[PDB]
Amino acid sequence: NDILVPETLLKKRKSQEKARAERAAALEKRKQANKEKRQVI
């Protein structure tokens, strides 16, 4: 007798995980760009 997770919530959680992964990748690339920018300036 366990209440299942609703299906639109499943879709929302999948999209949120994708957005979190993209955000982490963009943060890493922007950190690297910041370091190279500091050296070039």
Partner 1 sequence: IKQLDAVYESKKGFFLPANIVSQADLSRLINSTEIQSVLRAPKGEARTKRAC
Partner 2 sequence: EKSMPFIKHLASSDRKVRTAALNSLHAFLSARQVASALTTLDVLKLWKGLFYALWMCDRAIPQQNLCNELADLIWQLPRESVATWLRGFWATMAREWTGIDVLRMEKFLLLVRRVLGASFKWMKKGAWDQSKVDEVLGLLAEWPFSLAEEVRITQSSEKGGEIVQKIPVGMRLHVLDIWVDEVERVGLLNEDEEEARMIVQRISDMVDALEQTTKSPAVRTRSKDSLGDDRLPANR
Binding residues (CB under 8 A) for partner 1: these are 8, 11, 15, 19, 22
Q: Is 35 in the site for partner 2 (CB under 8 A)?
A: no
Nearer to partner 1, 22 or 28 (CB): 22
CB of residue 8 to partner 2, shortest distance in Å: 6
Residues contacting residue 5 through CB under 8 Å, at least 6 positions apart: 13
- One DSSP character per residue, 1-41 reads --PPPPHHHHHHHHHHHHHHHHHHHHHHHHHHHHHHHHHH-
Q: CB under 5 to 8 A by kind: which of partner 1, partner 2, none does 19 bind? A: partner 1
